[PDB]
Amino acid sequence: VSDNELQEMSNQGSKYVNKEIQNAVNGVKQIKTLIEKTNEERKTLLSNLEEAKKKKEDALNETRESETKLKELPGVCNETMMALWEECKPCLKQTCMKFYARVCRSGSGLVGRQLEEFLNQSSPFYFWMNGDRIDSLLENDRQQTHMLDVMQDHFSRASSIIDELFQDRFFPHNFHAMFQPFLEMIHEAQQAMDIDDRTVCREIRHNSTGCLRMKDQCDKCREILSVDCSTNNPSQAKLRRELDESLQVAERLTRKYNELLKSYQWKMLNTSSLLEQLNEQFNWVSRLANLTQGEDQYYLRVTTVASHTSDSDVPSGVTEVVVKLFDSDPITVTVPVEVSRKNPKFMETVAEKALQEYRKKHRE
Ligand SMILES: *[C@@H]1O[C@H](CO)[C@@H](O[C@@H]2O[C@H](CO)[C@@H](O)[C@H](O)[C@H]2NC(C)=O)[C@H](O)[C@H]1NC(C)=O
Ligand SMILES: *[C@@H]1O[C@H](CO)[C@@H](O)[C@H](O)[C@H]1NC(C)=O
Ligand SMILES: *[C@@H]1O[C@H](CO)[C@@H](O)[C@H](O)[C@H]1NC(C)=O
Ligand SMILES: *[C@@H]1O[C@H](CO)[C@@H](O)[C@H](O)[C@H]1NC(C)=O
Ligand SMILES: *[C@@H]1O[C@H](CO)[C@@H](O)[C@H](O)[C@H]1NC(C)=O
Ligand SMILES: *[C@@H]1O[C@H](CO)[C@@H](O)[C@H](O)[C@H]1NC(C)=O
């Protein structure tokens, strides 16, 4: 390669560095809108959760009403209920202790104590009136209300931090004066946002009440559900079915709310990833702004342009171009042989690929 050729190639390749400055600045604005867009997608998702919560809490009132209707229906349960209950508690305890020792593998004794402690402070009427499911829903409702109050407090806080950053009309040699205010705002926003058998064993750890799924295993507990109360009225089996149904509704609406929460979590994660990009982008314009101080328009210098013809170690269809960027280590870039050196795209490729290597490597 001619020496007069290299100096003109380098002089050409340095023009593509001046462009990368404007490109990196635009990339900030490209991220800026992506964040705002993602911020609007969750404001849409928030109003859906406002509505879904209303439908859920209305489905629970109807469940609480279907419950109390069954309670107030006159009539008494046969004393046989207490006889099963004393053979249902030891069966249920032994079952959950076995399951915990088998699958979960931990101290089955502690579980058995807590469960027996709960089974003595409970009545078989609780199981008969499906109180386990009723209380299960109420617990999930709190957590979903809490989990949203948590997400809403991190997001809307960071959202306001970002709504103070994006007010700057940005969206000189003394850029380090803008550098620190912007970069710290991104950090303050970032830290605001950061948060079968395996599952059941976790629920048994959280509360011994998780064992109540295994009531189906015990026969005596299954019998308790089929005892004649309400003096054997047809309204009983009618109200019991009406309760069963009003639960299914409240259970299904609780699921559909979780999927909207899991969606709200994706929005929160997505947005924190767009901040890491905005962070690394501002550290790239900072490095560029530093490295482009002065009246010098040299930034890229082509060292050697080799091929399979010259070096031979070079692969068959690439041309390895060694370059120095911003007065740093020599960088080797593989641009295809299909590209001719006459092509302005040749140095455009060398520059772009070289800027990537310097962006990832050079410590700053
Ligand atoms: C729940 O009640 C049962 C029955 O009263 C308790 O079982 C008794 O436990 C004591 C202490 O181990 C024994 O001396 C008795 O013989 C047991 N009686 C029967 C009928 O099993 C059980 O301990 C209670 N659960 C608690 C307190 O958590
Ligand atoms: C619950 O539903 C019943 C029947 O539809 C209604 O009379 C009652 O006002 C409701 N309560 C609430 C708090 O929504
Ligand atoms: C309880 O069972 C006994 C024996 O089967 C029966 O005579 C009685 O009518 C039952 N009472 C109720 C309320 O079901
Ligand atoms: C466990 O369940 C019982 C009954 O629903 C409840 O009183 C208690 O607060 C629960 N404990 C935890 C840690 O959720
Ligand atoms: C953003 O969320 C969508 C679903 O809403 C998901 O498919 C995608 O992987 C998420 N992206 C990131 C970076 O979390
Ligand atoms: C830019 O230069 C200043 C002054 O030397 C330095 O403190 C700062 O860390 C540099 N920024 C980058 C991104 O290298």
Author numbering: 26 to 196, 212 to 213, 239 to 260, 280 to 448
Sentences from the paper on this structure:
For crystallization, we designed a single-chain construct (Clu-Δ(214–238)) comprising a deletion of a predicted unstructured sequence including the furin cleavage site. Upon expression in the presence of the α-mannosidase I inhibitor kifunensine to generate uniform oligomannose N-glycans, purified Clu-Δ(214–238) crystallized at acidic pH in two distinct lattice types, crystal forms I and II, diffracting to 2.8-Å and 3.5-Å resolution, respectively. Crystal form I contained one copy of Clu-Δ(214–238) while crystal form II contained two independent copies. aData from two crystals were merged for processing of crystal form II. The three conformations in the crystal lattices differed slightly in their domain orientations, with root-mean-square deviation (r.m.s.d.) values of 1.5–2.0 Å (Cα positions). While the DD seems fairly rigid, its linkers to helices α2 and α10 deviate considerably between crystal forms, indicating structural plasticity. The N-glycans in Clu-Δ(214–238) point toward solvent channels in the crystal lattices and are partially ordered (gray spheres). Importantly, the model of the WT structure contains extended unstructured regions, including disordered tails at the C terminus of the β-chain (residues 199–227) and at the N terminus of the α-chain (residues 228–244). These tails are generated by furin cleavage in the unstructured sequence of WT Clu that is deleted in Clu-Δ(214–238).
Clusterin (apolipoprotein J), a conserved glycoprotein abundant in blood and cerebrospinal fluid, functions as a molecular chaperone and apolipoprotein. The Clu structure is composed of three domains, a coiled-coil (CC) domain, a small helical domain containing all disulfide bridges (hereafter disulfide domain, DD) and a C-terminal α/β roll-like (AB) domain. Structure-based mutational analysis demonstrated that two disordered, hydrophobic peptide tails enable diverse activities. Resembling the substrate-binding regions of small heat-shock proteins, these sequences mediate clusterin’s chaperone function in suppressing amyloid-β, tau and α-synuclein aggregation.
